[PDB]
Design an enzyme around this catalytic site. Structure first.
Site, PDB file in Angstrom:
ATOM      1  N   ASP D  45       0.819  -1.207   0.000  1.00 14.49           N
ATOM      2  CA  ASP D  45       0.000   0.000   0.000  1.00 14.49           C
ATOM      3  C   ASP D  45       0.856   1.261   0.000  1.00 14.49           C
ATOM      4  O   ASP D  45       0.462   2.274  -0.590  1.00 14.49           O
ATOM      5  CB  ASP D  45      -0.948  -0.003   1.202  1.00 14.49           C
ATOM      6  CG  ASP D  45      -2.136  -0.931   1.006  1.00 14.49           C
ATOM      7  OD1 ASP D  45      -2.492  -1.210  -0.158  1.00 14.49           O
ATOM      8  OD2 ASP D  45      -2.721  -1.375   2.018  1.00 14.49           O
ATOM      9  N   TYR D 158      -4.254   4.701   9.736  1.00 13.78           N
ATOM     10  CA  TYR D 158      -4.070   5.459  10.976  1.00 13.78           C
ATOM     11  C   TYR D 158      -5.375   5.594  11.752  1.00 13.78           C
ATOM     12  O   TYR D 158      -5.419   5.367  12.967  1.00 13.78           O
ATOM     13  CB  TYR D 158      -3.504   6.841  10.635  1.00 13.78           C
ATOM     14  CG  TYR D 158      -2.610   7.485  11.680  1.00 13.78           C
ATOM     15  CD1 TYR D 158      -2.579   7.035  12.999  1.00 13.78           C
ATOM     16  CD2 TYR D 158      -1.791   8.554  11.339  1.00 13.78           C
ATOM     17  CE1 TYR D 158      -1.749   7.641  13.947  1.00 13.78           C
ATOM     18  CE2 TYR D 158      -0.964   9.158  12.272  1.00 13.78           C
ATOM     19  CZ  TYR D 158      -0.950   8.704  13.574  1.00 13.78           C
ATOM     20  OH  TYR D 158      -0.120   9.320  14.490  1.00 13.78           O
ATOM     21  N   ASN D 159      -6.453   5.956  11.048  1.00 13.43           N
ATOM     22  CA  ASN D 159      -7.774   6.114  11.652  1.00 13.43           C
ATOM     23  C   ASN D 159      -8.157   4.916  12.515  1.00 13.43           C
ATOM     24  O   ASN D 159      -8.682   5.081  13.623  1.00 13.43           O
ATOM     25  CB  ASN D 159      -8.809   6.333  10.539  1.00 13.43           C
ATOM     26  CG  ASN D 159     -10.238   6.249  11.034  1.00 13.43           C
ATOM     27  OD1 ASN D 159     -10.832   7.257  11.433  1.00 13.43           O
ATOM     28  ND2 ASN D 159     -10.814   5.046  10.986  1.00 13.43           N
ATOM     29  N   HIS D 218       2.005   9.637   3.329  1.00 14.49           N
ATOM     30  CA  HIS D 218       3.335   9.387   3.875  1.00 14.49           C
ATOM     31  C   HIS D 218       4.185  10.650   3.996  1.00 14.49           C
ATOM     32  O   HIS D 218       5.210  10.622   4.686  1.00 14.49           O
ATOM     33  CB  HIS D 218       4.068   8.351   3.014  1.00 14.49           C
ATOM     34  CG  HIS D 218       5.380   7.907   3.582  1.00 14.49           C
ATOM     35  ND1 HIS D 218       6.525   8.669   3.492  1.00 14.49           N
ATOM     36  CD2 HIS D 218       5.729   6.781   4.247  1.00 14.49           C
ATOM     37  CE1 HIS D 218       7.523   8.032   4.077  1.00 14.49           C
ATOM     38  NE2 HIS D 218       7.067   6.884   4.543  1.00 14.49           N
TER      39      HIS D 218
HETATM   40  N1  K1Z Z   1       0.442   4.837  14.257  1.00 10.35           N
HETATM   41  C1  K1Z Z   1      -0.045   4.413  13.089  1.00 10.35           C
HETATM   42  N2  K1Z Z   1      -0.961   3.420  13.094  1.00 10.35           N
HETATM   43  C2  K1Z Z   1      -1.473   3.012  11.930  1.00 10.35           C
HETATM   44  N3  K1Z Z   1      -1.212   3.454  10.698  1.00 10.35           N
HETATM   45  C3  K1Z Z   1      -0.301   4.435  10.722  1.00 10.35           C
HETATM   46  C4  K1Z Z   1       0.322   4.956  11.843  1.00 10.35           C
HETATM   47  N4  K1Z Z   1       1.208   5.964  11.484  1.00 10.35           N
HETATM   48  C5  K1Z Z   1       1.096   6.027  10.180  1.00 10.35           C
HETATM   49  N5  K1Z Z   1       0.196   5.139   9.653  1.00 10.35           N
HETATM   50  C6  K1Z Z   1      -0.216   5.017   8.258  1.00 10.35           C
HETATM   51  O1  K1Z Z   1       0.935   4.861   7.451  1.00 10.35           O
HETATM   52  C7  K1Z Z   1       0.651   5.463   6.175  1.00 10.35           C
HETATM   53  C8  K1Z Z   1       1.933   5.697   5.414  1.00 10.35           C
HETATM   54  O2  K1Z Z   1       2.552   4.447   5.131  1.00 10.35           O
HETATM   55  C9  K1Z Z   1       2.287   3.893   3.846  1.00 10.35           C
HETATM   56  C10 K1Z Z   1       1.014   3.175   3.938  1.00 10.35           C
HETATM   57  C11 K1Z Z   1      -0.026   2.612   4.075  1.00 10.35           C
HETATM   58  C12 K1Z Z   1      -1.244   1.926   4.344  1.00 10.35           C
HETATM   59  N6  K1Z Z   1      -2.405   2.350   3.877  1.00 10.35           N
HETATM   60  C13 K1Z Z   1      -3.336   1.481   4.431  1.00 10.35           C
HETATM   61  C14 K1Z Z   1      -4.741   1.441   4.361  1.00 10.35           C
HETATM   62  N7  K1Z Z   1      -5.475   2.287   3.633  1.00 10.35           N
HETATM   63  N8  K1Z Z   1      -5.377   0.484   5.075  1.00 10.35           N
HETATM   64  C15 K1Z Z   1      -4.646  -0.377   5.793  1.00 10.35           C
HETATM   65  N9  K1Z Z   1      -3.320  -0.442   5.926  1.00 10.35           N
HETATM   66  C16 K1Z Z   1      -2.717   0.527   5.221  1.00 10.35           C
HETATM   67  N10 K1Z Z   1      -1.364   0.811   5.163  1.00 10.35           N
HETATM   68  C17 K1Z Z   1      -0.370   0.027   5.878  1.00 10.35           C
HETATM   69  O3  K1Z Z   1       0.043   0.760   7.017  1.00 10.35           O
HETATM   70  C18 K1Z Z   1       1.396   0.374   7.357  1.00 10.35           C
HETATM   71  C19 K1Z Z   1       2.287   1.595   7.337  1.00 10.35           C
HETATM   72  O4  K1Z Z   1       1.892   2.543   8.313  1.00 10.35           O
HETATM   73  C20 K1Z Z   1       1.784  -0.713   6.353  1.00 10.35           C
HETATM   74  O5  K1Z Z   1       1.397  -1.994   6.835  1.00 10.35           O
HETATM   75  C21 K1Z Z   1       0.928  -0.320   5.153  1.00 10.35           C
HETATM   76  O6  K1Z Z   1       0.806  -1.507   4.340  1.00 10.35           O
HETATM   77  P1  K1Z Z   1       1.924  -2.013   3.270  1.00 10.35           P
HETATM   78  O7  K1Z Z   1       2.566  -0.776   2.673  1.00 10.35           O
HETATM   79  O8  K1Z Z   1       2.896  -2.847   4.078  1.00 10.35           O
HETATM   80  O9  K1Z Z   1       1.154  -2.826   2.249  1.00 10.35           O
HETATM   81  C22 K1Z Z   1      -0.143   6.705   6.531  1.00 10.35           C
HETATM   82  O10 K1Z Z   1      -0.954   7.114   5.435  1.00 10.35           O
HETATM   83  C23 K1Z Z   1      -0.991   6.236   7.726  1.00 10.35           C
HETATM   84  O11 K1Z Z   1      -2.304   5.866   7.322  1.00 10.35           O
END
Ligand code: K1Z
Ligand code: K1Z
Ligand code: K1Z
Ligand code: K1Z
Lengths: 259, 259, 259, 259
Positions: D45, D158-159, D218
């Protein structure tokens, strides 16, 4: 007895400080900010936290007192109207003391710190991944915004905002809360706050990045090439001069429920 | 020594029970379910809770042991494969014992109960309003679905699902969690779980309806004309026979993180 | 126009009702509680919910109005002081109407219900296990205290106490929240509230026990031999007479933040 | 058709990229990373989010596709084994498209950004206090760690970690969640996540410090002399090429429940 008074620095706290010094001048009490046996903080809980850290190397020889010139504090829990009565009873001595537990934080690259509220570890730049080790056994790999380790009296502060339990400060424990943990097919954390007794050691260990922002109460510094952060209940305690009965749960009620 | 074995009642637990009895027959061990000094539960944590309550009037004279024939339990934490080793070491005696705190519940209309997990108070028919009183001072007026008071070893059960902290069972405390509290211009509750030390008394008092559903571990009965529910850490403790080292935090890890 | 007025039944609401009827007597307005085109509720949100259900078979022909004689309500959002102005503007007609979405609940053993706040499913006697099916695909096996499906305007009620999001009522959706879900090696639920658009169907199906307590707004009945509970956004809507601008987010602010 | 392929940059993704280019070479398909009409992301993602932002000025002319060479993604939801079938069906055209809503962020000192996941505002150095204004009415004064505004497809990111609801991406909305809000006698926030429809404008305004860390997906930059941050559902949408049926709720189930 040797005493000192710290002030938030606004008009209200400074003039209350000068008035208490004048009141102390009518007794066998000496103003000394080098080796006081009584430390009076006038302001809020933040002012009190700064007084604790100003004198954290003489904790066993100091009784602390907090006066709130703003809203009620959990450490600054006496009103300015009681200041003249505080001068008289502080000068006589023979008051009781109450002790609250403290958190010992060890940072290995060692440096050790005492917290009255909490210590936290957060990501500096980029993602935050740490292995959590409890008494030398790997407990979880945490990924998220950070972690918070709270004293009992700290549980009403950052810990509370993170969903932690409020613990009566007579319990010798520390409480670990999560900040925005990720949970999916990759990572897995416990979620719940964790409450540890004395002699339990919680160790945070880096996975990739070795740079984090580490806080101890209000102090927050960037720590480079960190290899480990160790938490345990301190053998040291903060001592409060006991003026009258203001129960912890009543301070909780007055601060969060109604007053 | 006098011993007894309770069984979940399925094929697996019954045959393991019969095999352990046969193994005990090769030692100076007498089967007695009236006055046993060793109580072995074979099944799950629910089976163990029923064994605790079957013998809660002889707690000071009994060492409990739990065997899980299904998934790992927090009280039923030994595997069936270890049963033959348990027979041998139980027969010799001289094993260590570990004690967990218990919750005393008093219901005034008095009746007193001991809980190993928790006691809860819920609405019977209609809205649930109770005044929460801590050490005789009114703390909050709670309106919502109910309240849960947990032991330390209970914190991994109902308490966990309600957002409570997980507490190491060496801490002598009880933890109060809310079930779906209303918070608006009318009502106000603390929200956070509350952790109380020994000798603190938490009293629930009715506002309008005097009928509630009160639970103690798995037992749940409707109690009529109730005037008060009082919670405090019991002076009594449950005693476990200590077979080997299986730390609480490892049981937490194995149950909720991975195994 | 045909109108009717329901009253909470206390002195304040009854006398306000009699005064409004007298005011309506000075216009071309007929009191009819069989086929009214205007339904005025005087009391609180509970009084309004009862008026909605009294006339839920003529929803498309009725404009509802709520007056709060106690604290501000989310449906009862006009003050008694405005009642004389409400009489005049209701009699003229030509006021605007606003429509909020409703929740359709189908119980198969079929019976269908409309909720303005929410419908919930709870355990009757014993443990609560249901399979959650979304658009015919099995989503999760839920074990815990119960589940809550909320309308948008219901999100400030039970849904809020369960951790649900507050949704603006212009969004045609329903929101599913959990009540004290178990999560361990056996069971696994999503945890988060779930928000569904129109035409999505969420089905709850029994695993063992087929008896549950099912609520629809304030009505709560025990339903025997239930095979399925189906939730979807209703095609029907409740219509409010629009007196002036009182934005939803301002009602949220006034109810939970300050007023 | 013009197409381009981005790669996470590891061995697996690079060689899958080279193989798909070779497969596309057997069709009327031209590789163009300046003005592609098809953008294929190979990685996770995070890789997909970078492809979206690489081409966010030609969103209306691009259909996006995500392939996950690691664990299942919410945007990268097709397996490498399906890549040869993706080449054939992408070359023919006539596939359906699906559109997800986006979040518009305006930063006034103006600069505007589009987010596919979320935008957050956090404290830079020191305490974070912002006034939250909804449709020009002051809603709350927030004090805490920060705030998060999520798209529907962002709700699983994040949400979710902040307690937000999961929203089906067909709903045109944005969701605001809190990060560690303080609530005491001084400050008061709503606590619950807030879900806003189209045309609602949420404005964050500084109280003291005007320096914050503002993230968009990001990308995270420190923004100086900021006077306002405005959030609203964008009029623009991201378009996905629809290969087959992989429902959102099934992706939720496969990612968080089991697979
Ligand atoms: N404290 C926190 N708790 C939760 N989330 C947090 C966070 N701080 C930051 N963030 C999120 O990081 C995003 C930036 O990193 C790139 C991404 C992404 C992403 N998008 C989604 C989505 N739509 N649904 C579900 N998993 C998603 N990921 C996955 O989150 C992980 C990376 O954080 C990886 O597993 C990604 O999966 P992969 O790259 O390995 O396939 C930001 O946008 C923010 O949302
Ligand atoms: N996101 C966050 N959510 C919650 N808390 C957060 C936080 N980030 C940081 N923190 C806390 O700040 C501390 C550093 O600021 C000094 C302090 C303090 C303090 N101590 C306690 C305590 N024991 N119980 C209850 N309220 C306490 N405050 C009050 O918190 C406020 C200041 O944060 C003021 O109202 C203080 O009251 P006053 O000074 O006006 O009298 C850190 O130690 C950390 O805990
Ligand atoms: N909404 C609710 N959410 C959570 N818990 C809820 C609950 N409503 C009720 N309860 C709990 O039930 C108890 C009564 O059922 C007997 C038990 C037990 C028990 N004890 C513990 C413990 N100490 N730590 C961790 N898991 C424990 N279980 C396991 O809970 C499950 C049964 O609930 C089984 O998996 C048990 O494991 P097993 O029997 O299969 O081995 C009550 O006492 C109450 O706590
Ligand atoms: N554990 C629980 N936590 C939270 N809510 C719980 C709950 N169990 C049940 N419920 C809710 O009760 C409803 C049935 O009681 C009638 C109602 C209502 C109602 N509607 C709304 C709404 N839309 N927004 C905001 N407040 C609303 N209330 C107010 O809730 C209170 C009564 O519960 C009163 O203050 C009402 O205000 P008033 O009548 O005094 O004006 C059910 O439908 C369910 O939602």
């Amino acid at each position: 007895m040797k005493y000192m008074i710290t002030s938030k620095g606004d008009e209200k706290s400074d003039l209350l400080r000068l008035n208490m010094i004048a009141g102390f001048g009518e007794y066998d009490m000496e103003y000394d900010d080098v080796e006081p046996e009584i430390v009076i903080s006038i302001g809020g809980d933040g002012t009190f936290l700064s007084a604790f850290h100003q004198y954290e190397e003489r904790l066993d020889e100091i009784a602390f007192i907090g006066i709130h010139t703003g809203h009620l504090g959990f450490y600054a829990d006496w009103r300015p109207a009681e200041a003249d009565k505080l001068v008289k009873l502080l000068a006589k001595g023979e008051y009781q003391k109450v002790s609250y537990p403290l958190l010992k934080t060890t940072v290995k690259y060692e440096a050790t710190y005492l917290a009255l509220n909490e210590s936290t570890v957060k990501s500096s730049g980029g993602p935050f991944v740490v292995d959590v080790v409890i008494n030398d056994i790997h407990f979880e790999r945490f990924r998220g915004d950070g972690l918070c380790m709270s004293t009992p009296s700290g549980t009403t502060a950052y810990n509370k905002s993170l969903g932690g339990a409020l613990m009566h400060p007579s319990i010798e424990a520390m409480q670990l809360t999560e900040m925005a943990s990720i949970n999916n097919r990759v990572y897995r954390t416990i979620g719940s706050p964790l409450v540890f007794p004395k002699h339990h050691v919680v160790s945070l260990q880096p996975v990739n990045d070795k740079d984090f922002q580490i806080s101890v109460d209000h102090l927050s510094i960037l720590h480079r090439d960190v290899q480990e952060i160790r938490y345990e209940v301190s053998a040291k305690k903060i001592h409060f001069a006991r003026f009258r009965s203001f129960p912890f749960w009543r301070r909780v009620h007055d601060s969060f429920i109604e007053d």
